[PDB]
Amino acid sequence: ATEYVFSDFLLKEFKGLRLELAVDKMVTCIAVGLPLLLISLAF
């Protein structure tokens, strides 16, 4: 006698899509950023 208990999970509703993986983004930021963070101290 509700007509409503369906409706809470009835409704269905992409710039928030990521492109790369998680740890692949880290091993690019570390393997490129750390040499350029130390060489810029040498300059």
Partner: peptide, 15 residues
Amino acid sequence: ANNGEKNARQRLLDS
């Protein structure tokens, strides 16, 4: 902060 940081660090190393 990686597409923007690696594109900003690339030009400020050579200067």
